[PDB]
Amino acid sequence: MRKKISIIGAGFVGSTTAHWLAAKELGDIVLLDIVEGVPQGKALDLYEASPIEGFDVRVTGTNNYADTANSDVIVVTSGAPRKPGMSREDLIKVNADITRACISQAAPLSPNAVIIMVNNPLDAMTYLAAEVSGFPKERVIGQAGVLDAARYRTFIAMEAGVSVEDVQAMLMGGHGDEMVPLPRFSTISGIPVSEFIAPDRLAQIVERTRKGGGEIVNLLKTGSAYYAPAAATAQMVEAVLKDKKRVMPVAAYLTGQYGLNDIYFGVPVILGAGGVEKILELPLNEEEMALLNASAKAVRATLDTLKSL
Amino acid sequence: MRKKISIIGAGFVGSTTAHWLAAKELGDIVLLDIVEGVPQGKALDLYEASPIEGFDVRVTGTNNYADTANSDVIVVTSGAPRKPGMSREDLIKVNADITRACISQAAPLSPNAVIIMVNNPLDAMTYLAAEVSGFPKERVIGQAGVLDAARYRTFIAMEAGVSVEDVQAMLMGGHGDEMVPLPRFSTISGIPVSEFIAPDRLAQIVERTRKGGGEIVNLLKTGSAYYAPAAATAQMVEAVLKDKKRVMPVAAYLTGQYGLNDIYFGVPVILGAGGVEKILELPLNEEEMALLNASAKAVRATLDTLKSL
Amino acid sequence: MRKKISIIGAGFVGSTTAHWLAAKELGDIVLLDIVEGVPQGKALDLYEASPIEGFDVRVTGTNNYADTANSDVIVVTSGAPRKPGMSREDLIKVNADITRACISQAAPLSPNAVIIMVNNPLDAMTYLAAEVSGFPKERVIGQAGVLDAARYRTFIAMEAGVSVEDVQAMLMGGHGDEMVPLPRFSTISGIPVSEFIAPDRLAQIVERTRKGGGEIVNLLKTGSAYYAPAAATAQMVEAVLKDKKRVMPVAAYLTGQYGLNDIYFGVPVILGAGGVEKILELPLNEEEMALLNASAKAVRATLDTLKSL
Amino acid sequence: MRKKISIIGAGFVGSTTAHWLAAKELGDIVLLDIVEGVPQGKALDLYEASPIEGFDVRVTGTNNYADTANSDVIVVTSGAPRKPGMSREDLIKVNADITRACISQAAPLSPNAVIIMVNNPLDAMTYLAAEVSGFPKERVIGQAGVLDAARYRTFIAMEAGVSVEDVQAMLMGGHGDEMVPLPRFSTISGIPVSEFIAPDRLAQIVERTRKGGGEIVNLLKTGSAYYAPAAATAQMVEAVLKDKKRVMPVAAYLTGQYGLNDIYFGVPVILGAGGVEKILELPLNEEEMALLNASAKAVRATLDTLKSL
Ligand SMILES: [Cl-]
Ligand SMILES: [Cl-]
């Protein structure tokens, strides 16, 4: 009995996540969407690559939540972009409705699953998925930090002229203005990044990381990033499926860590088959902690709007 | 000095091909398109996946053929779908113009490259690319058969209930009506496919292979297949870069094989760093040869229309 | 949780098999041997390679069968060496005692395991393993054919000038004089090997395959082959762990197939999570049957010697 | 054409390194040894695994240096074993003669190669290799630090309860008493190791790392480690062949870095197609410098013994 991964929402992120996972033979994959034909087509297309690439995975597309039953991991990409005229609460509302509909159908069919959210606003939707599923909180998480850390690591590897395999970095919070950069906690083969890159340039790289998603949006003209978001999501799925105990920034439920309670927030975790197996507590200095507290206030504000719906 | 692969046309097939190649660290990748922003965005997005996936490849996007210089392989996906009102010659004409423009700019900058075409009509455009580049014909080829054989192999593995790693198949010709199926030349770990699958069902699978591209089109609603076409293209690129001597059906220039002269046609080849290193001559029976001759007449008809432009 | 594989016998074959399973992150690995220190040493050495090779599995060396409990697959490599200069009968007696000691201790601790034997004489020892374990016959198999076919495929690829990835071959029986070669059931991308290689040369390749183990012994002057034997064994382990439904020659228990009853014999099977999920019955011609019947007589005589102990 | 790697010394380390390079299809491999039959045997065994493992590279065993011509990398593993019970000085004399014979024959045949030494005493033998070859110093390096760091990272990952993929560590000097441990320059996803592991336990881990080679020797009772030593060596080979710009400790020729001149010593470098492309100069504190200075004195004394031969 192979592992089973269901991916909800068969757009660019969801389908690319299926590609990364299939390539590694990580388990059978169900791609689900509301639109008829689209998940069926992408799934069959990917499956037809399998003799070339040498993986034995069933990739199927479906419009029926029944086909997601007994999944080991559920990935949710479904959501709604904002566009003009919408208020903050309007954007939160439409995504909350989408998230509730997905989780309320999927979770009871896979009571042992780890749920990985990849929609927006990420921390709030992960908080909602935890409420709706009623799963142990360790088993409901969100992907945000692995992507931002990946962009940062790319920029560092680029600038320092070194292998991307040798750059590691931790950060916290959400995306853009809510990101909590922590360049002190990044290294190249154990050596502080700040020994390779001077402060002014490092600050530019931190800012580029903040703006990294919008950078891609501006280039693509239509649509958002998907190759790296899907890679980040897939690395998380892998950590769960193989119990790898990866140390990653992940949206997790806090019970006093960093002085925060009753909130999902991007924090360093050990991630394995149990989901969040540890929340790590970094010795942040006053400047770093000021960044965290400001981000947590913003994340709290979004969460309060969700609760008031 | 890492290998260098340029991919012309940064749509679904071109960008997915970059993904398959990057994942295998096969060389630095240039993604080129006429549209500003789009190749830049997809390329940077893929590059930002690299610390997660562990590959050291430069992936860059560009609108400038100068950036393609000194490539080891050039992949061309650019072309034009037909839609209504267009005649046969009209469709051939617009793709010929696109193909000429791509090859005339790219080929002189990479005089040692192998050119791999993945546009339509595939055999005719490959014939044109050979004329325009003036390269040795062994170094100008087209991807068609690896995809159709992959779909067939998937269907066989599905039906027989066996690993896709154990199914192998040769076929000839082009796509759909121009495909020349050869189920006699397919095996599961050395054992004829016909020992696993009875004639009526095997005929259904052959027909499904013929219709395999349109199957995906019908499901997707908008757009065509890309995961498997890109995998096929990337496997060909790999064969060249690593001199693997893969035995594959490929659109190649014929000088008497199967009784055909002065034509590109899908035939079994040994594919390596020299491009086509051998054209294999199968002992086709009368029924198989009748299929080939009918397909070659159709491919000839397209080629004659190209020549008359 | 993670898959678990126990490998009994920490010699070259056992240790090299462990390396393969671990590199691929196929499961936690227990390496057991009677000699204190040796399995612990090899396991720790392999484990210390993990941050370089990027795998997260436990690799335990042990002298205690208790550490093998609840394994998904048991591999047995323990066996008297070299065809040591004793009688054929002496070899069977010493290996029967080893096999009985190994299986009687390991089997009760892993009642749902698939057992894969890799000692000598291969078919007889697999028969004894079935007897001692009491397991369903589908779950006790022997590795022999995958190695012999690998050597054959290597020789074929080299001679035909093609990729090893494109050569398939089925064969039957045991090793050496007991191998039943089947060049009719071998192909290159679905094309008969006989179309590439002339009959005299092919006969040489067949003979080289029979003598292939001894060719390696003679070169080394001390010890036997282990790289290809371990790869063959690991591939079978993988087939079970990932439920891949590989089509392979393996030593299986026969109940009438090919006219053979109450015997282990190398036959084509579908191998998956259930062990042998199907024994395939090839339409062997008169010549091929003569080879098989002679092979079986010899395998029977080995088995009868075992039964008379 | 394909990359070419020659590995001198067909023992456990050389043969296992070959296995790694081939599995990854990194280039054609030549395994050379003085003993007739042994390298031919090991090479053929490895080659016969290729259709199972899916790699297309040539794997040649030889007694003739002519077969190593025009290699991209030369790996030297040939060396007197075990710290054999002779004097320290005896060990240097025997290995100096072996190293001189190896380098004087191989270097002129591959004038553009990078040489990677893996014999003992490591720094001295790499110094001698530079002398005998006459190659630019950047192209003659020794593998030691990558192994010692791998053992350290293994121990750290196990103790902290995290993925080996997320642990980085830099260290300097040679093996054993000459290792310069640097736990300050080690991290888990960019976070200082000191935050995870208490000082007393970390000190134990450091000592285990110093004794790590001997720990393996004592368990095995015959022979030394080879899995992790070969992985470390292969990773360095890969860094050169794929121009990955890895940041690694390697034995490099010093001209003033860390106060050291005219000596080979384990230092952090950027390693790529050009060999050592940069020697990094860490801001070592007073305590760390004392370790380094003592290490250097000892490495100097080994070197002076070599110079007095
Ligand atoms: Cl231990
Ligand atoms: Cl040979």
Numbering used by the authors:
A (entry chain D), B (entry chain D), C (entry chain A), D (entry chain A): 1 to 309
Please quote the authors directly:
Among the few cytoplasmic enzymes isolated from S. ruber, the tetrameric malate dehydrogenase (MalDH) remains the most extensively characterized, at the biochemical and structural level. Sr MalDH shares more than 72% of sequence similarity with its non-halophilic counterpart Ca MalDH. In our follow-up crystallographic study on Sr MalDH; we determined the direct effect on solvent organization due to its acidic surface, by using a comparison with a non-halophilic counterpart.
